[PDB]
């Protein structure tokens, strides 16, 4: 974890998937699947409804994971006017503004992208 994520309180999780309305007992394939929940708003989703790979799912369960809308840049801690184009790491799902990457990026990377923390 990052220092600013450590001991930063997490919201009460809602035990329903906001995408399919199932619980941990029933995803869209009518099979059990544990939810993941946003640390800031508490809303939840099945990893299969979020379209997360098994490997990404394992990693975000060990991190202070944020949903798409709550996601803040792991460098500058902001969302801001360029929020819609924040990159999401394909290893840890953290967000980074292109201009906050190391090195700063002028154009969107192509294909799978791994952030400066994971690379």
């Amino acid at each position: 974890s990052l220092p600013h994520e450590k001991d930063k309180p997490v919201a009460e999780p809602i035990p329903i998937c906001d995408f399919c309305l199932g619980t941990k007992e029933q995803n869209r394939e009518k099979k059990p699947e544990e939810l993941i929940s946003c640390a800031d708003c508490g809303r939840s989703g099945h990893p299969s409804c979020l379209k997360f790979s098994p490997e990404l799912t394992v990693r975000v369960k060990a991190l202070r994971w944020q949903c798409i809308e709550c996601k803040t840049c792991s460098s500058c801690r902001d969302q801001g006017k360029n929020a819609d184009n924040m990159l999401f790491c394909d290893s840890c799902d953290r967000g980074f503004h292109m201009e906050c990457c190391d090195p700063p990026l002028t154009r969107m990377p192509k294909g799978m992208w791994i952030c400066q923390i994971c690379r």
Binding site: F19, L21, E69, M86, L87
Partner: peptide, 22 residues
């Protein structure tokens, strides 16, 4: 790479508000 925009399209968006959990 994925962005906020592309991730939104991937989920298809939340279920309708009145059907969501309170």
């Amino acid at each position: 790479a994925r962005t906020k925009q592309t991730a939104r399209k991937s989920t298809g968006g939340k279920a309708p508000r009145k059907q969501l959990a309170t």
